[PDB]
Ligand binder design. Structure first.
Ligand SMILES: *[C@@H]1O[C@H](CO)[C@@H](O)[C@H](O)[C@H]1NC(C)=O
Ligand SMILES: *[C@@H]1O[C@H](CO)[C@@H](O)[C@H](O)[C@H]1NC(C)=O
Ligand SMILES: *[C@@H]1O[C@H](CO)[C@@H](O)[C@H](O)[C@H]1NC(C)=O
Ligand SMILES: *[C@@H]1O[C@H](CO)[C@@H](O)[C@H](O)[C@H]1NC(C)=O
Lengths: 54, 54
């Protein structure tokens, strides 16, 4: 969740969201339960003028 | 404060309570003010189906 400052210094929001795949319903802890695995990271950048709209 | 998950994996609640003896009214910090001491730990296990009833 990127935004902006008076000067214009771009600032990210500690209020950002990390999503792990779904396991045992909770999605706050994902575990690997297989013999092999591959991990990939992807991201989406959203912005706002107003706080928390994105 | 133990409970249960959909699968059944028993889970304890960070919402658990540790009680120290009473000193200077506050019970969040207990100090030893004697020449000798003995410390014992005891516990009670309570459970719930509904959250926070125990
Ligand atoms: C993340 O999701 C929360 C709801 O938990 C939402 O309020 C917030 O705007 C989102 N933050 C992002 C997408 O940066
Ligand atoms: C700094 O904050 C004050 C109070 O919100 C505001 O009046 C002023 O315009 C701000 N100046 C900036 C954004 O540089
Ligand atoms: C601990 O006491 C709190 C009140 O501070 C209560 O709401 C909570 O259910 C108790 N947790 C236990 C006994 O695990
Ligand atoms: C996972 O959570 C959703 C939303 O609360 C619920 O509909 C679903 O039945 C749950 N599945 C479980 C408990 O495995």
């Amino acid at each position: 969740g990127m935004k902006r400052s008076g000067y214009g210094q771009p600032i990210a929001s500690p209020l950002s969201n990390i999503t792990l795949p779904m396991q045992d319903n909770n999605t706050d802890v994902y575990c690997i339960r297989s013999n092999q695995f591959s991990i990939y990271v992807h991201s989406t950048c959203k912005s706002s003028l107003w706080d928390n709209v994105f």
